[PDB]
Structures are given as structure tokens and as C-alpha cells.
């Protein structure tokens, strides 16, 4: 399975990938799975995490 | 809805979030979507992605 990129993306940090409207992209499967943006109630902080590492309450 | 982190996590990053595990989590609505690792067939190049960015093929 083969995504298209539908906008141009510049990477912001040293793990982000570059890309141009058009671009054809694969997938890759991870041990940490997609990531997601998240508020921790525990300490305030926020940012991204890896999905695989946390459950439903 | 919130989440409990099942192990502890280090940032990597100035984007990613660090917690201990039992943290609790509670995700945040992004414009991008969730973020994807992906590799560019166009370019060679590998990294993370925002979801809403692409389409497949």
C-alpha cells in the first residue's frame, strides 16, 4: 500500500521526513506504532508519543 | 477519554513527550493526524509524517 502526498511538507526536527505534493510514500512498520500528540495530567508537559506504549484508562 | 502509559518513554527530541509508566495521558486533537513513519519512494529519504498530509495511492 502506496500514499500520495496531497501537500508539499518541510521537515522541522532531525526525525521528520521532507516531502513535495506528489510524492509517493510507503509505510513503515514500527515496534513503537503511529504517534500521537498528547497532554500528560501527570506533569503538564505535551508532545508527541509513541501509541504502542499506552492504553486506555 | 485518557490514557495510562504502560512503560516509561525518554524523549528523544525536542517534540517528543517524556512520562513514567502509570503517567496519565490524555491526547490532543492536531491538524496534522496522527504522525506515520514512512519511506519516500520519490526520494529515498525515511521519517516520521503527518497523516493528513497523504493519501493512498
Do not use: M
Not at 522541522?12 to 515496534?31: A, C, M, P, W, Y
Amino acid at each position: 500500500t502506496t500514499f500520495v502526498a496531497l501537500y508539499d511538507y518541510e521537515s522541522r526536527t532531525e526525525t521528520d521526513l521532507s516531502f513535495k505534493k506528489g510524492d509517493r510514500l510507503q509505510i513503515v512498520n514500527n515496534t513503537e506504532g503511529d504517534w500521537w500528540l498528547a497532554h500528560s495530567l501527570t506533569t503538564g508537559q505535551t508532545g508527541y508519543i509513541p501509541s504502542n506504549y499506552v492504553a486506555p484508562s
